[PDB]
């Protein structure tokens, strides 16, 4: 037959890393100013990740022996708090935080009411998270992509605290061997072992994607890169999903 229709083809989705928010005002205030200037240019769904506080609740939860389905909603809470912080900084521009069920069923009317809304990037898998790892798999990057692709959005841009994807952790033990990857495919990343700045589950949902052809990972600590990425300019790592264009 053919792929499903695009529900919100004019939508741009932006995922803000929780570790970016963790840096506090020094990183958030420049990002908020850039977002302010983007409101008249795009129709934005801004989704926040969890960051370091989810690591702490994982530490406590794992020490208590709790399963992965218990850890998933605990981490998702932290992504939601980051969203409330970001929305508060944009409130004077008409921006508010919206919940999952509102995002899932009323995003259209809300983006008719205002230029942007903020929500949580974490998906509602929660106690129905998949088993296997003790770390919940379907995190902020994965939820943001599932949502963007389900909507048939014009794009998804991931805002990181690094320039993009390297061949090794650029802040880790092998940081000396880390080479920057301007462009890669989800399949190539999936066949690699080692850490990434994006969920491994993101690569899995990219393989079954129906609309989004590319996702760019850009450094939110460099003012202007988010603005450039939303115009299709190559300022970070481009991830090809495997969706073929017309």
């Amino acid at each position: 037959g053919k792929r499903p229709i695009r529900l919100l083809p004019w939508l741009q989705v932006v995922k803000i890393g929780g570790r970016v928010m963790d840096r506090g005002a020094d990183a958030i205030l420049p990002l908020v100013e850039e977002l302010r200037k983007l409101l008249p240019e795009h129709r934005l769904l801004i989704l926040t990740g969890a960051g370091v506080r989810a690591r702490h609740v994982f530490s406590v939860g794992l020490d208590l022996g709790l399963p992965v389905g218990s850890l998933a909603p605990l981490a998702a809470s932290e992504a939601g708090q980051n969203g409330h912080i970001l929305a508060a900084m944009l409130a004077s521009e008409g921006v508010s935080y919206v919940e999952h069920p509102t995002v899932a069923d009323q995003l259209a009317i809300h983006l008719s009411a205002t230029r942007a809304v903020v929500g949580s990037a974490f998906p509602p898998y929660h106690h129905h998270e998949f088993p296997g790892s003790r770390i919940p798999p379907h995190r902020a990057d994965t939820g943001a992509f599932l949502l963007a692709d389900a909507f048939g959005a014009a794009g998804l841009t991931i805002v990181e605290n690094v320039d993009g994807i390297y061949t090794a952790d650029p802040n880790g033990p092998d940081r000396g061997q880390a080479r920057f990857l301007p462009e890669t495919s989800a399949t190539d990343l999936a066949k690699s072992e080692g850490p990434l700045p994006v969920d491994r589950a993101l690569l899995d949902v990219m393989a079954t994607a129906r609309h989004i052809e590319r996702v760019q990972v850009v450094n939110g600590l460099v003012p202007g890169r988010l603005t450039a990425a939303l115009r299709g300019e190559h300022v970070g790592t481009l991830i090809r999903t495997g969706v073929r264009p017309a």
Partner: protein, 268 residues
């Protein structure tokens, strides 16, 4: 790997780091509801059939809860397939179909719950709030809808828009994440056969089989949502499931008593 090594990794590494993943895997394992059994009541196979199928199972539930803690999830059935057909014909994506199918499993939970209300058994959202019912001999059971909460975040199948994770997967993942002792799927066939017994003359009954053996026989998607078999192989707590015929009187009671009616599917 000590808790200290795990916390350092949790703070300094990406959650994708294999070293962090391996340290988390060594954590203790707590079962939240270790003495409960999760039961899925089929939508199309049972509830859609009306009183002739449902009334005997109500009797079995009331009798079984005297000695067994029960988490009873409902399927969706033919009304969900109608919704899926309408929405698929419109080009709507799997995430939208997922939301539609949830409403139908809710209907079935409501009907079953109303037949059980006078016996003290409530309808709840899910296992998350079954603590008090399951601790009371007067109740000792709850009813919930079996659909997972993924909604628009449903991962689509490789082909088509039918949501891959439906009420079989929802009920199984509940059993797995609450560390329950047993998972029973109640359908309208005695168990797994070598072929679909409804559309095949000489199918052979299979009392026990592993997921790998099922796949090698071409049975990956037969009597259970085939994603469930993959989830079963990844499960930490529920490493086998039992499929029984809800139309045979007493089959559920006998399964709860440890009788090997139906088919036992093992992860390995």
């Amino acid at each position: 790997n000590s808790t200290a090594e795990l916390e350092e990794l949790l703070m300094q590494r990406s959650l994708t780091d294999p070293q962090l993943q391996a340290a988390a895997a060594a954590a203790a394992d707590f079962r939240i509801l270790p003495d409960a059994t999760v039961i899925k009541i089929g939508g199309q196979s049972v509830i859609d059939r009306g009183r002739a199928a449902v009334y005997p199972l109500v009797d079995e539930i009331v009798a079984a809860r005297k000695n067994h803690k029960l988490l009873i999830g409902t399927g969706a059935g033919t009304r969900a397939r109608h919704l899926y057909s309408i929405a698929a014909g419109l080009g709507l994506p799997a995430g939208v179909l997922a939301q539609l199918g949830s409403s139908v499993a809710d209907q079935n939970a409501a009907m079953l719950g109303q037949l059980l209300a006078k016996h003290g058994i409530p309808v709840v959202g899910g296992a998350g709030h079954s603590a008090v019912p399951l601790s009371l001999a007067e109740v000792n059971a709850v009813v919930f809808s079996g659909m997972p909460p993924y909604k628009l975040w449903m991962r689509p199948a490789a082909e088509g828009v039918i949501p891959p994770y439906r009420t079989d997967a929802g009920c199984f993942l509940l059993a797995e994440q609450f560390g329950c002792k047993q998972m029973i799927f109640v359908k309208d066939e005695d168990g797994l056969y070598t072929a679909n017994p409804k559309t095949s003359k000489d199918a052979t009954f299979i009392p026990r089989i592993s997921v790998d053996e099922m796949k090698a026989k071409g049975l990956h998607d037969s009597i259970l949502e085939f994603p469930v078999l993959d989830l079963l192989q990844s499960a930490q707590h529920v490493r086998e499931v039992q499929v029984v015929n809800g139309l045979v009187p007493g089959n559920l009671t006998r399964a709860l008593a440890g009788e090997h009616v139906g088919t036992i599917i093992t992860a390995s």
